[model samples]
Target: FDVNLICDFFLNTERQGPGSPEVTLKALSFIDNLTNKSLIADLGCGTGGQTMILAQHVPGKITGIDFFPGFIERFNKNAEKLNLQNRVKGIVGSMDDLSFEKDSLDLIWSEGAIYNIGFERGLKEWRNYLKPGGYLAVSESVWFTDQRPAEIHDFWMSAYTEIDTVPNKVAQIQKAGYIPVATFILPENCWIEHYFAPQAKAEEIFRRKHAGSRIVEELITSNHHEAELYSKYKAYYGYAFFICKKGF
Candidate 1:
C-alpha cells in the first residue's frame, strides 16, 4: 500500500519537503530562546527531520523518541547517514511514558503528531517530561483568526477530530502548568504554495513513476477533495508553532 513509499517520503526529506528549511530554522529558534543551552527531546518524531535539525543547531544532546519501531530504526539509519551518531540518539517509547529523568530535558518538541492522541491529553501527558524551566516547541493546525462556518467545522472535525484553535492551545498549555511564551501562525501562502507546488510538479512524475502507488492515489483523492470543497469553506489552515515552558 505504498507504506514503504510513505516511509521513503519521510526519510528523504528533500523528496518529501514540508516547508522551507528557513521556516524550520525559525521554528527551532523558539526552542533556542527557551532552553539557552542545546539539549532537546523530540517526542513523536516521525523520521527525525526536525530532530536532525535540532542536533545541528543545539549545543547539547538531541534525542528523537517515537512509538514506532520502524521509524526508530529509520531514524538510526538517518543519523548514521549524516554521521551524527555521537550527538543524536533515537529511542522507542510513548510520549506518556518516556524514559527520561525528571527535569532532564531542556526542550520537548512535537510536530503534527500530537493531535492524534488528543491535544489536551498530549499536553498533560508531556508536562512532566520537561525540566522546571524547560520549553516545549510544537506545531499544530489551529483555527484561523476568522472562524469557519458550521459546515466547514463539521468537515474539519471529521478529518481532524482533535482540532483546537491557537488561543485554546495556548490556554491548554497554561492549564497544564506550562507558560506559553510565543506563537507563530505560518503564513497562509506557505501551506498553499508548499502543498500545491508539489502536487503540480508531481503530476508528471506521478504519471511516469508512481502512477500506481496506492499512497499517491489516496493522497491525490484527498488533496483534490480538499481543494474543491474544503478550501472554499475554510479561510486558512496552517501550523501554529508554540513555545512554552513549565511555569510551576
Candidate 2:
C-alpha cells in the first residue's frame, strides 16, 4: 500500500474507521473502574477519534498509538485542541510490538483496528500487557450470517481470509484466556457516515485532481467498489464490538 497516498486520502477525517462517539461511549459504559488514575491504551488509534472519546468520558490517562507518524501528529494536535493534553498523548508505535510493559495497563481498547494484527493474535498478544481482569474492547469486521453473498465473501476473503462469525469470535476470546463480557454490532450507518462517506468524498476530489494516474484511479475505484458492495451485501457482514476481560 502507498502509505503516503492512503494518508493523503484520509487527511482531515475525524475517524479512520467505522465508529461514532455514541457507540464508543456505549462500549465504555460496559466496562467498570475507569477511574482518573486508570491507564488506557488505544492501539492503532488513527487520528484519535475513539481515543478522544475515551478521554472525554473516562478521565483516565490515555495513550493513543499508531504506526503512522502522520496519524500520531494529528492525534496529538487533536488532544491539544481539546485541552486534553494533560490526560492524553499520542505515540508513533506499532501494534506488532507495543511499548507497554506486561500487566501494566488497565484497559486495552481498539476500534476497527485490531484486524490489522489478526483478531485472535491481537487478543492473545495484548493480553500480556493488561493487568489481570483488565478490560479489552475491540471492533472487528465479522460475518453477520452464515449465508453470505459470494461477491462480498470473495472480496474479504482475499484480504482478511480469517474473518469469522460472532460466535466463532466469542469462542476465540475464550480460547485466548479472556471472558467475553458483551458484544454488539455497529449500526450500518456507523460504517457509512464516519468511514466510507468521507472516503467517498475524498475519492471524488482525488479522482478529479489525479485523473490520469493509474494508482490513484485504482485506489479510488477499489474504495468505492467496497462501499458499493457493502450497500448490497451488508446483511452478510458488518463490524461488531467485542467487550472482554482478562481472566485472573
Candidate 3:
C-alpha cells in the first residue's frame, strides 16, 4: 500500500530525482570505450528515462532494473515507444540483491537511487558485476562542505543516513576497488527545474484522485519539506555525479 502510494506519486514524473539530459551526457563523456557488444546495467532505473538517453548515445544492450513492477512496465513501454526495445529491457529487481553474473557488465549506472542500499555498500557489492575497466556512474546526494545546518542535516539523515562529503565518497569509491574518474555537482536547477517542478503537477493529480487522504497528504507534505530544504540549504548540499572504473 505504501509502495503503491509512493510509486503512483512518482509514476508520471520524468525523473524520480535531480538530473538532466545534459548532465547525463556530461557524465557519459567520461566513458569513451563502450562498443556495440558492451552490456550496461542501469540499476534503479525509474521508467528508464536516463536509460533511454544512454541507449540512444551508446550501442549496447542495457538492462534497466527497478523493484517496482509498474515502473518496470512503464520502462519497457517507454523503451518500446522509442524503438529501443531490441537493445533495452527492464525487469523487476532489487538493487540490494542482484543476480547478474560477476564481471559480466561493461557499465553500471544509477541516478539518485543508490542511497536506498547505501553508497559505499553499493559500490562494493555492485563492483562484482562490472567487468575490469567497466564504468560506474551514479548521482548521489552529498554535502558540499563538511558541515551544514542541523535542520538540513537532520532532514537528510532521516531520509538517507548515507549522505557524506564528496571527498569521503571518492575515498569510498577507491576503497571499493574503483578508480575514481570524475565528480561534478549537479546544478541546482536539476532539482528545481527537472525534479521538483514535476512534483507539483503530480501532487495536483494525486490530490484530486485521493481527496483529503492523510496518506497522500503525508507524501506531499514531506515532499514539500524536502523541496523547501533544497531551496534553502542548497549551498551546503547537492547531488554529485560520480564516475568510476574498475581497474583490471
Candidate 4:
C-alpha cells in the first residue's frame, strides 16, 4: 500500500474513516455505570476523532493508542487544541501488545480499526485489560446479508477475505467470553461525510499535481474506486458497532 499517498490524501481530516460523533455518542450510551474516574483507552485511535467524542460522552480519562507515530503525534496535538490535554493522552504502541496492567481498564474502544488486529483475536486478547464487568466497544465491517451481487461480493472478497455477517460477529463475541450488549449498523451518511467527502476533494488536487506519475495515478484511481464501490454497494455491506461487557 502507498502509505505516504494515503496519509497525504487524508491530511487535515479529523476522522480516518466512516464515523460520526452522533453514532459514537449513541454507542457510549450503551455502557453502564461509567464514572468520572473510569479509565478508557481508544485503540488504533487515528487522529482522535472518536477519541474526542469519547472524552465528551464518557466521564473519565481517555488514552489514545496507535502504532503510527505520526498519528499519535497528531492525536496529542488535537487533544491539546481541544483543551483535553488534562483528560486525554496518547501512547505510541501496537494494539497487539498493549502494556497496560491486567484488569486496569474500565473500557476499551476502537472505531474502524479492530480489523487491523483481526476481530476474534482482538476480542480474546484484549479481555485481559478489562475488569470483570468492564466494557469493549468496536466498529467492524460486516455483511448485512448473505446474498450479494457477484461484482460487489468479489470486490470485498478481494479486499478482506474474512469478512462475515453481523450474526457471525455476535457469535464470535460470545465465544470470546463477552456478554453481548448491543449492535447497530452505522448510517450511510457516516461513510460519506467524514471519509469519502474529504478524500474526494484531496484526490482532486492530487490528481492535478501528480498526473504524469503512473504510481500516483494508480493509487488515486484505486482509492476512488473503493469509494465508488461503497456508493454502489453500501446496502450489501458496511460497518456495525458492537458493544459488549466482559463477564465476571
Candidate 5:
C-alpha cells in the first residue's frame, strides 16, 4: 500500500476512524475532574477532529499528537480556524514514544485510535504518564458477539490481531491495571453517516483525480471492501468507547 496516498486520503476526511463528536462527549462524561487546569493529551489525533470537540466542552490544555506531519499540519489549521489554537496544540509525534513526564497528565483521550500500539500496550505504558486516578479514554474495534461470519472475522483480524469481544476487552483493561469505569458501543450511524459516507465522497474525488493509476485503484478497492464488510456484518462487530482509570 502507498502510505502517502493512504495518509492523504484520511487527511481529507474529518475523522480518521469511526467516531462522532457526540460519541466523544459520551465517553468524556464518564470521567471526572476535567477542569481548566487539567492536562489532556489526545494521541493519534488525526486532524484533531474529536480533539477539538473535547476542547470545546472542557476547559483544559489539549495536546493533539499524530505521527503524520500532514495530519498535524491540518490539525493545527483546523484548530486555528475554529479559534481553539490557544488551548489546543497539534504536534507531529509517535504514540509509542510519548513526551509527557511520568504521572503528569490529568486525563488522556484517544478516540478511534490506540489500534496503532494495541489496546493493552497503550493502557499499560500510558499508565505511567497519567496521574493517579486520572482517566484513560480510547475507542477500539471490538467483536460484539463471540461468533461471526468468517468474512467479517477475517476483515477485523487482518486489520487488528488484538481484536476481541467486549468481555475480554474489559478483562484486558483490568489486567493492565486500569479501572473499567464504563463502556459503550459506537452506534451504527457512526460508521454509516460519520465515516463511510464521507469516505465514499472522498474516494470518488480521489479516483477521478488519479484516473487510471494502479495504486489508487488498489487503495480504493481495499477501502471499499472494508466498508462493504461493515455494512454487511455491522451487528457482529464495531468500535467501542472504553473509559478507564489509572491507579494501581
Candidate 6:
C-alpha cells in the first residue's frame, strides 16, 4: 500500500501526533447518539487516532481500514504506545474496496482521508457496508461559501474536483440515500490549535534535534505556502463534520 507522496507536515505529525486528538474529540462530541455497544467501521482511518477515540465510546470494537501500509504500521505503533492494541485494530484496505461484510457495520467514520478517493464515490460505495440505520461521521475540507478564486477552484477542481460546500454536502448526503443528521463548521480555533501552534512547536523541536534536516526544512517551506493559501481564502477556508444516517 503506497501513496503518491508524503507531505512533510505529516512527517512532523507522525512524530508528535498533531491534530489526532482534536479530530477524534470532535467526532466523539458530535456522535453521542449511538450506544457504546455499537460496532463502527472507520474507513480510510489513517494511524487510528480517531478510531482509538471511537473505541473508548463504543462498548464493542472499532476496526480501522486504510490502503496505506505505512499508515497501518504507524497506527499499530500508536496503539502499542497507548497500550490499546486489544481495543483498537487497523488493517491495510481502501474505501473503493472495503471487503467488509455487507450491511454489517453499525457506523462509519472518515477523516481527511476520503478526498483522496472521491467524496460522492465514498458515499455511494460505502452504503452497502452500512446497516439500514448505521451512522456515518466524516470530517472534510470544505468551502465556507460558494465563491472561490480560480487558483483555489482550479486547484481543488483538478485535485479534488468533487469538493463541495456545506449545503452541497448535505444535498449529496440525501442524494446518496442517507439521512443527513448535521453539518457543523469546525471552529477556526481548532485549526489554530492543531496546525499553526504545533507547527511552531515542531519547528522548534526539529530545529533543535536535527537543524537543517531536509524534512524540517521542507515542512517550513510548505507551511509558508500553506499560509499563503490560507491568506488567499481566509474568509472562505473552513472544515465541517458531517453526520449522516443510512436510512430515511
What are the RMSDs of all candidates, in order?
A: 3.3, 1.5, 1.0, 1.9, 1.4, 3.6
In model 2, what are the clashing residue pairs, if there are any? none
Q: Model 6, residue 37: what's the lDDT?
A: 65
Q: Which ten residues in a row have the lowest lDDT in candidate 4?
A: 5-14
**TM-score (all chains, Cα) for each model:** 0.81, 0.95, 0.97, 0.93, 0.96, 0.82
The TM-score of predicted model 2 comes to 0.95
- Mark the 10 consecutive residues where model 6 has the least summed lDDT: 1-10
Inter-residue clash pairs, candidate 4: none
Per-residue lDDT tens digits for candidate 4, residues 1-248, read 35665555555464777788889999989998689989999999987878988887778899999877777887889899989979999888888988889999999999988888999999999999998889999998899998998998898778777679999999999999998898999998888987788777777777787668676788778878988999889989999999989986
Which model scores highest in TM-score? 3
Comparing 2 and 5 on lDDT, the stronger one:
5
Cα lDDT tens digits, model 6, 60-135, are 6678887777778878888778777776787887788667788887888887777867788888888888888788
What ranges in model 5 sit over 4 Å off? none
lDDT of 2 by residue, 106-168 (tens): 999899888788999998899999999899999998998888878889998888877899999
What is the C-alpha lDDT profile of model 3 across 99-194, one tens digit per residue?
999899999999999998989999989989999989999999899998788899998878888999999999999989999999999997799889
Candidate 2 C-alpha error for residue 147, in Å? 2.2
lDDT of 5 by residue, 3-91 (tens): 77778788777677789988999999987888889999999988888988899889989999988888899889989999988999999
Score each candidate by Cα lDDT. 0.70, 0.86, 0.91, 0.86, 0.88, 0.71
Q: What is model 5's C-alpha RMSD?
A: 1.4
Q: Regarding TM-score, does 5 or 6 come out ahead?
A: 5
Clashing pairs in 3: none
Error of 5 at 57 (Å): 0.2
Order of candidates by TM-score, top first?
A: 3, 5, 2, 4, 6, 1
Comparison by lDDT, 4 against 5, better one? 5
lDDT of 1 by residue, 13-39 (tens): 332323444566787776644334556
